[PDB]
Design a protein around this ligand. Structure first.
Ligand SMILES: Nc1ncnc2c1ncn2[C@@H]1O[C@H](COP(=O)(O)OP(=O)(O)O)[C@@H](O)[C@H]1O
Ligand SMILES: Nc1ncnc2c1ncn2[C@@H]1O[C@H](COP(=O)(O)OP(=O)(O)O)[C@@H](O)[C@H]1O
Ligand SMILES: [Mg+2]
Ligand SMILES: [Mg+2]
Ligand SMILES: [Mg+2]
Ligand SMILES: [Mg+2]
Ligand SMILES: [Mg+2]
Ligand SMILES: [Mg+2]
Ligand SMILES: [Mg+2]
Length: 302
């Protein structure tokens, strides 16, 4: 198989992998390359992808993983996966504005993938545990050519149910929930607490998506894309910065005045976003309810 793998241009990178466009048996792929220092994230990500029943319309498609020794005497680990020309949701939102229906399509498809990730499927030979993503954000979501999302980057994800479990501030700082910023996640109910951390981050993703919805800025132009909290903390905020703004001061991204609350759809959208990122983690929507709320919003478009 992998003797015929060709790497082309670099298309992305984060803390753990450098991601290249590639060719495998003359078909296009993406190749995430890890150094030996990040081997454990490769191991983790590969094994999450190989958990039974992980193939799903809103989960990135994994092909194969592999190791090689480089010319200069270094170990490299390669995670080969489907190539998504649109890239991350972050990149896609910076380039596109969408109307109500297509914005809901982005938001619903990412929510559907998270609800599936979060759901335990007792199946013996095919057991799928509930899995927490642990760094959910729009750079770890990819956008398919048909305009729907897939969840990606399981380098930090953890199994939450079943046997041989372990108990664990390692995510992306901008998207950390308040209880994480306080070091006070309730690890006694570990399964629920980790899902609630994910759900807070999904709320921020909702805000980022709908800030680029052409129908929410009528008679006006859509603001340029900005990540959650960028106007308030800039790029690369510090842990302490986020702690004061998000947890101490109880702040969240702001809904524009242009979302004048006389529309029933807009009022409902705002309440669903707020039900995801509230301070009381036990009171946030679950992923399965957010998926249903999102679909019910679309249905309240008639
Ligand atoms: N299969 C893919 N197709 C297209 N772009 C990708 C793909 N996987 C990752 N990327 C891009 O590479 C970036 C980093 O990939 P990711 O797997 O998140 O690495 P890290 O674990 O280092 O954050 C993503 O934000 C995205 O822009
Ligand atoms: N069919 C099953 N598949 C997966 N996990 C199961 C099944 N039945 C029970 N369990 C769970 O597996 C756990 C046992 O894990 P084990 O590896 O024995 O210990 P630990 O997780 O403490 O290291 C129990 O808490 C139980 O809830
Ligand atoms: Mg990263
Ligand atoms: Mg490692
Ligand atoms: Mg695992
Ligand atoms: Mg990433
Ligand atoms: Mg935050
Ligand atoms: Mg429900
Ligand atoms: Mg909607």
């Amino acid at each position: 198989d992998l003797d015929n793998l060709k790497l082309l241009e670099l298309i992305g990178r984060g803390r753990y992998g450098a991601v290249y466009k590639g060719s495998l048996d003359e078909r296009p792929v993406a190749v995430k390359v890890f150094s030996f220092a990040n081997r454990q994230n490769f191991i983790n990500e590969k094994n999450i992808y190989r958990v039974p029943l992980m193939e799903h319309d809103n989960i990135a498609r994994f092909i194969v993983g592999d190791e090689r020794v480089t010319a200069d005497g270094r170990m490299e680990y390669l995670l080969v996966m489907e190539y998504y020309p649109n890239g991350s949701l972050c990149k896609y939102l910076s380039l596109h504005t969408s109307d109500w229906v297509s914005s809901c399509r982005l938001a619903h498809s990412v929510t559907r993938g998270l609800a599936y990730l979060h759901t335990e499927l007792p199946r013996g030979d095919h057991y799928k545990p509930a899995i927490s993503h642990r760094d959910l954000n729009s750079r770890n979501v990819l956008v398919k050519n048909d305009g729907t999302c897939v969840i990606s980057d399981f380098g930090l994800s953890m199994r939450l149910t079943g046997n041989r479990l372990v108990r664990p501030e390692v995510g992306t700082i901008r998207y950390m929930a308040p209880e994480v910023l306080e070091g006070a996640v309730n690890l006694r109910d570990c399964e629920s607490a980790l899902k609630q951390v994910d759900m807070y981050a999904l709320g921020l993703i909702y805000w980022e998506i709908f800030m680029r919805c052409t129908d929410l800025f009528p008679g006006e132009s859509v603001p340029e894309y900005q990540m959650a909290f960028q106007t308030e903390v800039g790029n690369h905020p510090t842990f302490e910065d986020m702690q004061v703004l998000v947890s101490r001061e109880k702040q969240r991204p702001k809904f524009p005045e242009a979302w004048k609350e006389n529309s029933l759809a807009v009022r409902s959208l705002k309440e669903t976003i707020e039900d995801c990122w509230g301070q009381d983690a036990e009171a946030r929507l679950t992923a399965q309810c957010a998926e249903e709320r999102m679909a019910e919003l679309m249905m309240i478009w008639e």
